[PDB]
Amino acid sequence: IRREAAQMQVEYQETQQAHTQAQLELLQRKFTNKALYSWMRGKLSAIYY
Protein backbone atom coordinates (compact mmCIF):
# COMPACT_ATOMS: atom_id res chain seq x y z
CA ILE A 1 0.00 0.00 0.00
CA ARG A 2 2.91 2.34 0.75
CA ARG A 3 4.44 1.39 -2.61
CA GLU A 4 1.18 2.29 -4.35
CA ALA A 5 1.07 5.67 -2.59
CA ALA A 6 4.68 6.37 -3.58
CA GLN A 7 3.86 5.46 -7.18
CA MET A 8 0.96 7.95 -7.19
CA GLN A 9 3.41 10.59 -5.97
CA VAL A 10 5.49 10.04 -9.12
CA GLU A 11 2.34 10.59 -11.18
CA TYR A 12 1.68 13.74 -9.13
CA GLN A 13 5.11 15.15 -10.03
CA GLU A 14 4.66 14.21 -13.70
CA THR A 15 1.31 16.02 -13.74
CA GLN A 16 2.94 19.11 -12.23
CA GLN A 17 5.61 19.01 -14.95
CA ALA A 18 2.93 18.95 -17.65
CA HIS A 19 1.06 21.77 -15.89
CA THR A 20 4.03 24.14 -16.12
CA GLN A 21 4.47 23.15 -19.78
CA ALA A 22 0.87 24.18 -20.50
CA GLN A 23 1.38 27.48 -18.66
CA LEU A 24 4.48 28.29 -20.71
CA GLU A 25 2.82 27.46 -24.04
CA LEU A 26 -0.23 29.56 -23.12
CA LEU A 27 2.16 32.45 -22.44
CA GLN A 28 3.51 32.07 -25.99
CA ARG A 29 0.11 31.76 -27.71
CA LYS A 30 -1.05 34.86 -25.81
CA PHE A 31 -2.16 37.80 -27.92
CA THR A 32 0.07 40.13 -25.87
CA ASN A 33 3.03 37.78 -26.18
CA LYS A 34 6.74 38.61 -26.46
CA ALA A 35 6.66 39.23 -30.22
CA LEU A 36 3.83 41.76 -30.02
CA TYR A 37 5.53 43.74 -27.25
CA SER A 38 8.91 43.71 -29.02
CA TRP A 39 7.51 45.16 -32.25
CA MET A 40 5.32 47.72 -30.47
CA ARG A 41 8.12 49.39 -28.52
CA GLY A 42 10.42 48.89 -31.50
CA LYS A 43 8.01 50.85 -33.69
CA LEU A 44 7.42 53.44 -30.96
CA SER A 45 11.15 53.86 -30.28
CA ALA A 46 11.72 54.77 -33.93
CA ILE A 47 8.77 57.17 -33.81
CA TYR A 48 10.04 58.67 -30.55
CA TYR A 49 13.46 59.16 -32.15
Partner: protein, 49 residues
Amino acid sequence: RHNLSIDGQPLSLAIYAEPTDPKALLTSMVQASQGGSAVLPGTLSLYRF
Protein backbone atom coordinates in the same frame (compact mmCIF):
# COMPACT_ATOMS: atom_id res chain seq x y z
CA ARG B 1 20.71 -28.89 -15.35
CA HIS B 2 19.13 -25.43 -14.95
CA ASN B 3 21.82 -24.03 -12.60
CA LEU B 4 19.52 -24.05 -9.57
CA SER B 5 20.16 -25.17 -6.01
CA ILE B 6 18.52 -28.20 -4.41
CA ASP B 7 15.73 -25.93 -3.12
CA GLY B 8 15.03 -24.35 -6.52
CA GLN B 9 16.59 -20.96 -5.80
CA PRO B 10 18.48 -19.50 -8.79
CA LEU B 11 22.27 -19.30 -8.65
CA SER B 12 22.87 -16.34 -11.00
CA LEU B 13 22.01 -12.73 -10.21
CA ALA B 14 19.98 -11.15 -13.02
CA ILE B 15 20.12 -7.66 -14.55
CA TYR B 16 17.71 -5.35 -16.36
CA ALA B 17 19.65 -2.31 -17.73
CA GLU B 18 17.65 0.54 -16.14
CA PRO B 19 15.40 2.57 -18.48
CA THR B 20 16.94 5.73 -19.93
CA ASP B 21 15.73 8.70 -17.77
CA PRO B 22 12.69 11.00 -18.19
CA LYS B 23 12.19 13.14 -21.30
CA ALA B 24 12.11 16.92 -21.77
CA LEU B 25 9.41 18.39 -24.01
CA LEU B 26 9.49 22.05 -25.04
CA THR B 27 7.28 24.51 -26.90
CA SER B 28 8.35 27.45 -29.04
CA MET B 29 7.04 30.72 -30.43
CA VAL B 30 6.10 30.62 -34.12
CA GLN B 31 6.03 33.70 -36.35
CA ALA B 32 4.71 34.20 -39.88
CA SER B 33 4.99 36.79 -42.63
CA GLN B 34 2.69 39.80 -42.16
CA GLY B 35 1.93 42.62 -44.58
CA GLY B 36 0.91 46.25 -44.23
CA SER B 37 -1.84 48.59 -45.36
CA ALA B 38 -1.98 50.48 -48.66
CA VAL B 39 -2.74 54.12 -49.48
CA LEU B 40 -5.31 55.48 -51.95
CA PRO B 41 -5.35 58.86 -53.73
CA GLY B 42 -6.68 61.62 -51.50
CA THR B 43 -9.71 63.90 -51.72
CA LEU B 44 -9.41 67.69 -52.06
CA SER B 45 -10.73 69.45 -48.96
CA LEU B 46 -12.69 72.70 -48.98
CA TYR B 47 -10.65 74.13 -46.07
CA ARG B 48 -7.09 75.42 -45.88
CA PHE B 49 -4.22 73.33 -44.52
